[PDB]
């Protein structure tokens, strides 16, 4: 059936069945995407619904214990496990299930199955693009979320002392992670995070302007005020005036797009670059390579007691966060800070 | 021929200029240039400003041992409060520098400039025969800027609580705001974050889908691809509908986050969930919300080193 | 022997402006950290 018109085998029949068009496109990558993603979602839900974190973190995080949607999470394993893969059949759990769920292995289960689900999803995007005969720019775009997930949930915990310092799958847990980076890593001051936030805000800006400009430069292709109905999806004529939009934005802003392909490629390119740079910054953080302090200003402040800048105030705030949060954030250190050593504004 | 005023208004309302000088432009241009000039001069060189009102100033100028990242235009002194502080109201120019006048001048002129910029957007939309709703979309960053620079100082009663005009000032303001109001736990900040993330997602997806479909104006094949991918057939098959959704999502998100900001300006904080899960005996069990509370408590104690003198921060 | 695979690189003014803006913005962002 191929180039040389040869016979058909098991692989041919499997390929014909898998790629058959239906409501739910399975594809070859479906065998990987569907079970992994299904078990990731199931693990997250059954963990945030029944499983607790009393023994791993000393916290109560579940619906059964009385937490709502915002303060429920699947917490990471205890710091004692370090970087253990923590299989249900592993030496830690010895095959037991209730101990395994009680020991924090459900986080590792969810994270690993979700990562493989992401891989399967990108493979599915590739398969769909090949089937429809289109350039697979969607997979190139989706590369950035995978990079962010790998940097934050896998590479960073591996660089640290264990899975304990990974983000936990929950809203309040993510907020804790964010504040932890602020207090300890000075993550706001890292230039890579600056480039990432610039990219994300620029992507939102581009989306807003493109939508408004397209919707405010339509051609009068029909009667009535409801312009949405005046559009035929099979038409071969442009639905908005590129020349008018170009002139308007060149006279308002100063520079305006003149190529549709370049415009949409720029929309694709900005956020992908932003999150890739954020991922590189997080990779740098994983090894404690922090853009924490400016040596010149620190020396000047130490020498001159009258020297104050917003940078020094941020340093003081970070020190306060660290000292007041590490007491309960990291139980395995067994830190007991006397009330007289905690940093505190003396004014009271 | 025509009188002087007729020629002047013909020149002003002319679409042949390189940059459209609208009737809103006649106010936008001077205010924006004044704000830009004062901001540049203050950033390059300006003496330390007594932001806290407790006779200790902070330096934010390049010529005063700062760099681009840590430089800022320090907000107005706390002692000034909400009083109008123009140059002519100060005994000397150095006093105006010390008390923090340039921040107030820049903020006022910049707010006027952005309002007139939105007006000029509408005006040039009108002069070219377009539907005039680009200004409505642009209002969301304008609303956010107004809430950051104007509404929050009004609610808190002083201009010293406004956002400093500097990179490190932004981070300090954000840490302050999370410490004092718990911004992260508010539904409106959650909606703003959702709007920003969704804007990035939809931008990337739309760019990729349109670029892939621009073979040797978007064809219907991209709609089929999207329907096959995420199992949402007929969700977006009209180009006008798709672009309207693209415009609507981030604008609504930013509107709601700005409204949440202005709401907290009047001391209406976000959700509070500390000491919620309680043991049968009565003991309190820690939750991730309690760890957030601990971080906020750590931020609050070192908030102002020597400004407070009473146990409760009513200000 | 002359190579059939011969091509010329082009860079319009827009690309030049983008590149100059990119390098200058990167220098502005990273100068504070490089000088420290």
């Amino acid at each position: 059936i191929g180039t040389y018109q040869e016979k058909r085998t098991w692989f041919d029949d499997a390929d014909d069945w898998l790629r058959q068009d239906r409501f739910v496109f399975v594809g070859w990558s479906g065998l990987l995407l569907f079970p992994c993603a299904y078990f990731a979602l199931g693990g997250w839900l059954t963990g945030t619904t029944f499983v607790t974190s009393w023994y791993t973190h000393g916290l109560a995080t579940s619906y059964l214990e009385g937490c709502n949607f915002l303060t429920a999470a699947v917490s990471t394993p205890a710091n004692s496990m370090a970087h253990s893969l923590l299989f249900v059949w592993g030496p830690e759990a010895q095959g037991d299930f209730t101990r395994w769920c009680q020991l924090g292995g459900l986080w590792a289960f969810v994270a690993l199955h979700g990562a493989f689900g992401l891989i399967g999803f990108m493979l599915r995007q590739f398969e769909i693009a090949r089937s429809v005969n289109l350039r697979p720019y969607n997979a190139i775009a989706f590369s950035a979320p995978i990079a962010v997930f790998v940097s934050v949930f896998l590479i960073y915990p591996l660089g640290q002392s264990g899975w304990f310092f990974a983000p936990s799958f929950g809203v309040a847990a993510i907020f804790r992670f964010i504040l932890f980076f602020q207090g300890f890593h000075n993550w706001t001051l890292n230039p890579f995070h600056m480039m990432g936030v610039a990219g994300v805000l620029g992507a939102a800006l581009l989306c807003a302007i493109h939508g408004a400009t397209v919707e405010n430069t339509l051609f009068e292709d029909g009667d009535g005020a409801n312009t949405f109905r005046a559009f035929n999806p099979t038409q071969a004529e442009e639905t908005y005036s590129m020349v008018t939009a170009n002139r308007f934005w060149s006279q308002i802003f100063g520079v305006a797009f003149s190529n549709k392909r370049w415009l949409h490629f720029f929309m694709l390119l900005v956020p992908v670059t932003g999150l890739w740079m954020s991922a590189i910054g997080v990779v740098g953080l994983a090894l404690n390579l922090r853009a924490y302090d400016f040596v010149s200003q620190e020396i000047r402040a130490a020498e001159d007691p009258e020297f104050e800048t917003f940078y020094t105030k941020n340093i003081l705030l970070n020190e306060g966060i660290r000292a007041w949060m590490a007491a309960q954030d990291q139980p395995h250190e067994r830190l007991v800070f006397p009330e007289e050593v905690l940093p505190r504004g003396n004014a009271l | 021929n025509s009188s002087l005023w007729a020629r002047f208004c013909e020149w002003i309302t002319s679409t042949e200029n390189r940059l459209y000088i609208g009737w809103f432009g006649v106010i936008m241009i001077p205010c924006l240039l004044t704000a830009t000039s004062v901001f540049i001069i203050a950033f390059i060189a300006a003496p330390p400003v007594d932001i806290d009102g407790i006779r200790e100033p902070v330096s934010g100028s390049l010529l005063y041992g700062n760099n681009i990242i840590t430089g800022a235009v320090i907000p107005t002194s706390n002692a000034i409060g909400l009083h109008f502080y123009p140059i002519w109201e100060a005994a000397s120019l150095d006093e105006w520098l010390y008390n923090g006048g340039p921040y107030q001048l820049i903020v006022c002129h910049f707010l006027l400039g952005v309002y007139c910029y939105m007006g000029r957007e509408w005006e040039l939309s009108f002069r070219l025969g377009m539907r005039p709703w680009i200004a409505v979309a642009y209002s969301a960053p304008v609303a956010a800027a107004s809430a950051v620079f104007l509404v929050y100082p009004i609610g808190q009663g002083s201009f010293s609580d406004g956002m400093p005009l500097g990179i490190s000032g932004t981070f300090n303001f954000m840490i302050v705001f999370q410490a004092e109001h718990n911004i992260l736990m508010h539904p409106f900040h959650m909606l703003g974050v959702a709007g920003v993330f969704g804007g990035s997602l939809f931008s990337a997806m739309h760019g990729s889908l349109v670029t892939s479909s621009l073979i040797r104006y978007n064809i219907v094949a991209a709609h089929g691809y999207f329907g096959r991918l995420i199992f949402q057939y007929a969700s977006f098959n009209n180009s006008r509908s798709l672009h309207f959704f693209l415009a609507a999502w981030p604008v609504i998100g930013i509107w709601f986050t700005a409204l949440g900001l202005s709401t907290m300006a009047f001391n209406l904080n976000g959700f509070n969930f500390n000491q919620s899960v309680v043991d049968s005996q009565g003991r309190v069990l820690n939750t991730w919300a309690d760890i957030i509370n601990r971080a906020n408590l750590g931020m609050e104690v070192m908030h102002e080193r020597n400004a407070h003198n009473f146990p409760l921060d009513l200000a | 022997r002359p190579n059939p695979n011969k091509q010329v690189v082009e860079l319009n003014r827009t690309s030049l402006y983008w590149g100059l803006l990119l390098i200058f913005v990167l220098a502005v962002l990273f100068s504070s950290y490089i000088f420290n």
Binding site: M242, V243, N246, S250, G254, V255, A256, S258 | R18, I44, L62, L63, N67, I68 | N12, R13, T14, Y17, L20, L21, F24, V25, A27, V28, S31, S32, F35
Partner: peptide
């Protein structure tokens, strides 16, 4: 010294912005 470098960088960026706005390639066949 470093302040002069920062000022030069900012002035150069502003000059590039001005040149891009004004001395732009005229767009044809939009």
């Amino acid at each position: 010294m470093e302040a002069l470098v920062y000022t030069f960088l900012l002035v150069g960026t502003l000059g590039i912005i001005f040149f891009s706005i004004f001395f732009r390639d005229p767009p044809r066949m939009i």
